[PDB]
């Protein structure tokens, strides 16, 4: 068939950018030619990870007119996404974008992004990749395919470690992250829309900042972000979903549990902690359990992931399959599967959840 | 000399027969009197007791029979308060183990609260789940500090549709108090027990989505909820979530309870009762303790005595409930589940039903 070279530019050269790098290295015809980051420590580490020569820029505006790129990846702090997108949108080269979640951090940003994105002709993909985890993909196919009968309930449990230290401590305050239920939980709101094939009408949440980062001072201020919550989401069709989050439950062997209940069957998956975050040599595999109602007899199977695909990132192989899809979108050989529209809904959902917590009331979604 | 107790059973149906089988495992337990307005129920229950007793159609004659030291009530939910009132005004004041829910409406609860404070003899509300051996390990771990400061409690119940009962009593909200009372009082009460706190706010989303759509009473179908998510806030800032599906009987584990603190997480999985699962494929209950700091979860099976497990469908819990009630009858020990505990569980469930209906959280005092 012949591998077609795509020249990628990376705007933001931090932790997640380096994961993008390792996933692009598994995909023939993936050439990184330009990297931007205002911090040279980040560029040194990232160039080293790429392991071949590239052109670096401290500002993305020069990368955009460098003439070196066919497609962009944005992995900068959450509150910078809209501003970089605006510069891409007004650039005269119409370049495809894979923009990291959350696509934006406030309601004002979302209102503005919505108008600007509809006027842009090139593909814009929001990098919420969890659907591409092989076990999650099995649950989606089962739900969409009717293997559960009519679907009514969706539970998502994420039990994990506290937010990691980042460059300039950008992820410690709501003002830069959009809040925990945007930063961390947009993934889950979007899976709810995808799995249930419906739109949310009402969100209620209870949560707090109970445990984490109490001993970290940023100009004498303590982090204001949530570290645990319960969220209950209603949908137009009458389906209902629940998210449980703890950022202080890293002892849990399985970091994610997703369960779906229909009137014919239940299905569930358990996703292990990424090797880099768990005990060496105590690796569990992801499992899927299908539990029909009628002839009682559950079935459990492991869902293997290619060794190299799994080791290239910390999201159970998902970033690789995200890149296969984005590549196809760049070539015009496939559609954008996670759109700006999907991004905006996930953000508004998370924003509504944060407001619900703070004001002790459910929030309607329009 | 053990100390014999003569038990009277008011209500002689399915749960009464479980009470019977558990009492048969406890020396000094003699059933002498059974009451039930339906003779089919009495026949089946007498057969289960397997020795002669005196039967009555009405509990009022049982109460003055002279045959009893203590009572067990296992009648339909909406009859509890009326039987308790007759017990409360009886000349011989007898201890009562009254089945959940202790009552079905807010009017009943207001009335029960005043009447029960004026009654001198023990009244135990028979919410037994705390005595399931795996749940008891979770309670001790939470109370004992093994999790550090406790913040989160999740309870997931995935089970079969409500069973067919005598006179189809459990199909409408007006007789049951609604699903979040009938079925979920157990869970509201465990929340109060495990978190050692009082609720301030409750929110729920639920519907009647799947079950009993083909069972008709003059063209009317059951109006009861068959699935729900409930989120409960507590005075201290602790938070709990209950998930319920009455159409998820395919699940090998019927109950999942998890508790998260700032030092550790603990979780149990409770198997489906043998009588409701495939023969020969019974699973053991597991408890998993998951510390944060030295990564390294620990998993163990929690055995239950074979006869204790086979005597009931609540994983041995009814046995340990009866050990406690026995002590209360003898003046050897306190009532561990009081009427006050019953009322809180009911008002929690009633608030949850109102939350669903009004689309808003309901404040609790
Ligand atoms: N999809 C996922 O699974 C996933 C996982 C982690 C992070 N992310 C997202 O990736 C983004 C980056 O997070 P991270 O973990 O890489 O953090 P990081 O702190 O390791 O990297 C951020 C980098 O951006 C640079 N930067 C700061 N301001 C910039 C600007 N204006 N323009 C360009 N670069 C700028 C910083 O110098 C740093 O190198 C965020 O949106 C985060 O939410 C996504
Ligand atoms: N604690 C538990 O785990 C558990 C389990 C099952 C049932 N229960 C409770 O037990 C009670 C009975 O439920 P069940 O499953 O045994 O139902 P069932 O229908 O099997 O038995 C109920 C019995 O009560 C009798 N009855 C009806 N009206 C009566 C009255 N006025 N006085 C006396 N008896 C009367 C009926 O004739 C019938 O035999 C309910 O409160 C139910 O919620 C508790
Ligand atoms: O653990 S941190 O790196 O602090 C935070 C990150 O955690 C996961 O990777 C999520 O996918 C991601 O959305 C989030 O940005
Ligand atoms: O399955 S049914 O017998 O219809 C329903 C009953 O059964 C369960 O065991 C619960 O413990 C009990 O509280 C509830 O009333």
Author numbering:
A (entry chain A): 7 to 372
B (entry chain B): 8 to 372
Give verbatim excerpts from the published study on this entry:
Here, we identify an alternative approach to sulfoquinovoside hydrolysis that is adopted by these organisms and discover a family of SQases belonging to a new glycoside hydrolase family (GH188). These new SQases operate through an oxidoreductive mechanism that results in net hydrolysis and involves a catalytic NAD+ cofactor. The SqgA proteins adopt a two-domain fold with an N-terminal dinucleotide binding Rossmann domain and a C-terminal α/β dimerization domain. The structures reveal homodimers, consistent with molar mass analysis using size-exclusion chromatography-multiangle laser light scattering in solution.
